Amino acid sequence: EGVEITFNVNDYDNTLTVYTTRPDTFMGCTYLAVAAGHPLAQKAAENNPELAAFIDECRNTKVAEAEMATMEKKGVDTGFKAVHPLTGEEIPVWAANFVLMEYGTGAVMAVPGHDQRDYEFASKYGLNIKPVILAADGSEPDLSQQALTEKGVLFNSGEFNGLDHEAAFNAIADKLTAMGVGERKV
């Protein structure tokens, strides 16, 4: 089971939609990443020559999902800001080479504290790494070297603090659904 989540973007006529099987980590989302070929990336390329160059480079490189663990991850800040719907804070939207258009929306929500691929991209570009899952012994996670991917009790997640994995999964999915910006997928 998973959740589709929709974000509004400042100064942009459309929304961004993301799919996640880890909605329990949602309060740790610190940026969004879109494919080189995403409409928002092309829109931003109009007033950004670095992005234009990045997009052309990605055009040549066909990256396969399964070969990505091995590939050099690359991205460019689009300068667009998405609003995190539960937090109300602006987060940057990056174009990245590892996000594809073929399967899915061409946009991902990044949680570098709790997703290893996200951790590596955020470390490389100096993006925020925000912890929202406690280590299994109940301590703050050690994020100094890598992401903590184990399901656990939430902290630093406002109203969802103290909830275990299944409770948090459901509570955040329900919150987003009631707000009209989330949809559970079978």
From Swiss-Prot:
UniProt keyword annotation of Mitochondrion present: no
Q: Which residues form a coiled coil?
A: none
One CC-aspect GO term? cytosol
Name the UniProt key words of this record, in alphabetical order.
Aminoacyl-tRNA synthetase, ATP-binding, Cytoplasm, Ligase, Nucleotide-binding, Protein biosynthesis
The compartments listed are: Cytoplasm
The lineage's top-level taxon is Bacteria
- Assembly mode: Monomer.
Q: What is this protein called?
A: Leucine--tRNA ligase
UniProt source species: Escherichia coli (strain K12)
